[PDB]
Amino acid sequence: SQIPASEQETLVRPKPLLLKLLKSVGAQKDTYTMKEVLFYLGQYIMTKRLYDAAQQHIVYCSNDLLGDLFGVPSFSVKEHRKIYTMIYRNLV
Numbered sequence: 001s002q003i004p005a006s007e008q009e010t011l012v013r014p015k016p017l018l019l020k021l022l023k024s025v026g027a028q029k030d031t032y033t034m035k036e037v038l039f040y041l042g043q044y045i046m047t048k049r050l051y052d053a054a055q056q057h058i059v060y061c062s063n064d065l066l067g068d069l070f071g072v073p074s075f076s077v078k079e080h081r082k083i084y085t086m087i088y089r090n091l092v
């Protein structure tokens with residue numbers, strides 16, 4: 001959408017705690033495409049109900065490993081470059 005397709009399709013190696021998160025929702029490898037990392041992050045967010053009906057575009061990740069990894073208590077799913085940057089902080 002806001003992120004170039006080529007950037008989305010690149011192979012990445014998560015750092016250990018990001019890998020822990022992905023493994024907790026069924027991921028079974030050491031390397032992923034960015035798009036794959038984003039999918040499993042999505043499944044994690046939905047599993048842990050890190051959302052709210054009053055603000056439907058906001059991930060509420062405070063007091064959660066995702067919050068610790070991203071360094072924020074919440075963020076908007078519309079901020080695609082900001083999300084990519086938060087993910088790059090968690091890649092080898």
Ligand SMILES: C#Cc1ccc(CN2C(=O)c3cc(C(C)(C)O)ccc3[C@]2(OCC2(CO)CC2)c2ccc(Cl)cc2)cc1
Binds near residue numbers: 038046050059077
């Ligand atoms: C940059 C970027 C980017 C932003 C959003 C998405 C897709 N998703 C969304 O639109 C989205 C929206 C919400 C709420 C209910 C809060 O609106 C929760 C989670 C997601 C998310 O996953 C959707 C999925 C898997 O595809 C579980 C079904 C998501 C995934 C990872 C992240 Cl880091 C954030 C959101 C993908 C990439």
